[model samples]
Target: GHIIRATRKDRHSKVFTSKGPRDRRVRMSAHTAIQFYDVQDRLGYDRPSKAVDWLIKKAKTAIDK
Candidate 1:
């Protein structure tokens, strides 16, 4: 069993610097790279390495079926 939650805001006013978008550091593997991006987008995963793992498992699950 595993899950989690919140960061409530404080009343004290503060100036914050804007953050730029994160760099793309995850290089997806071959063969599934193209389709993998699609799968992650549909499944709502950003930089999801586990999604890629599941894709490989999906291949095995199919072939082994």
Candidate 2:
């Protein structure tokens, strides 16, 4: 019980809605998908474009396919 509860305490149930700024090392695919993850990362808060998010999200994960 301690182990299970302990893990949940630190686990991210969702990336987009979780706490502080996420780092560069963790790819978004770890949450739902990867770096069109955020054009924010493209410039770290750029709000680049919705098209860019869709483009990279589709492009990279497609390679994983």
Identify the candidate with maximal TM-score. 1
What local lDDT score does residue 60 receive in model 1, on the 0 to 100 scale?
Answer: 89
**Model 2 regions lying over 4 Å from their true place:** 1-48, 62-65
lDDT for each of the candidates? 0.59, 0.47
Show pairs that collide, candidate 2.
Answer: 28-33, 29-33, 40-44
Candidate 1 per-residue C-alpha lDDT over 1-65 given as tens digits, one digit per residue, 9 for 90 to 100? 21122224633323332453333245657876778778988878776776776678779857776
**TM-score attained by model 1:** 0.36
Give the Å error, residue 14, model 1: 42
Q: Candidates' TM-scores? A: 0.36, 0.21
Q: Lowest lDDT 10-mer window, candidate 2? A: 1-10
